[PDB]
Design a protein around this nucleic acid. Structure first.
Ligand SMILES: [Mg+2]
Ligand SMILES: [Mg+2]
Ligand SMILES: [Mg+2]
Length: 170
RNA sequence: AGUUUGACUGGGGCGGUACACCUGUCAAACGGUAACGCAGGUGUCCUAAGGCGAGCUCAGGGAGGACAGAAACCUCCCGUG
């Protein structure tokens, strides 16, 4: 019934670890991300100096990476094992993307290391349909139109259908 | 002993610099146009903040994401500046 060019898919996954400060803690955090993705992450600096947070401008604060394709689908399932396939209702944004967090990275499938710590991280699945890339192309870029967009209800339907997930009414 | 001891200035002195310059207005839709008219600025700074080329998009806001809160990072959307 539905056009095959409308089926939802995962664009990227966008793991993020926001450590407070720079140094060996951030280097260990980037090591955690590399172990999780098989893929070298990138450090992000602080926009502004905030001394209540102890950060300074242009200081390496966090580490993040984006995963696409089969590897993204694998990492998302690992993260959803920790969450027990239970995403709260408000975890879904109005643009059709959702996300969650985990507190310990060990239960993702990575063995503990005495030197490395107890880092948590953020998962943020960005959903899309085929044809979403026209907003990113260089030549003749465009928007996707109203029907082709993803709503919060459609993203929730996709999660319930694909991962047999449970949406708590929070 | 010789000489000097600025100028403008609603008298002169005191105060200011309207004494060399730049922006908006005055200024009366070309240009020009005065008051110790109004609002301000200048005596610097930059091997890049100069020269090309490439790739990007900014302020702000909305919605989301462990710690993370009104402000830490990540993601999407709107965004004529
Ligand atoms: Mg005239
Ligand atoms: Mg004129
Ligand atoms: Mg260019």
């Amino acid at each position: 019934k539905e056009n095959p060019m409308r089926e939802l898919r995962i664009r990227k996954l966008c793991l993020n670890i926001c450590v407070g400060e720079s140094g060996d803690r951030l280097t260990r955090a980037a090591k955690v991300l590399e172990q999780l993705t098989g893929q070298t992450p990138v450090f992000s600096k602080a926009r502004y100096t905030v001394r209540s947070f102890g950060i300074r401008r242009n200081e390496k604060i966090a580490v993040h990476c984006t995963v696409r394709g089969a590897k993204a689908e694998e990492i998302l399932e690992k993260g959803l094992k920790v969450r027990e396939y239970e995403l709260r209702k408000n975890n879904f944004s109005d643009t059709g993307n959702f996300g969650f967090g985990i507190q310990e990275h060990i239960d993702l499938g990575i063995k503990y290391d005495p030197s490395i710590g107890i880092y948590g991280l953020d998962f943020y699945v960005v959903l899309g349909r085929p044809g979403f890339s026209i907003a990113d192309k260089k030549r003749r870029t465009g928007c996707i139109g109203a029907k082709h967009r993803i709503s919060k209800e459609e993203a929730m339907r996709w999660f319930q259908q694909k991962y047999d997930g449970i949406i708590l009414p929070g």
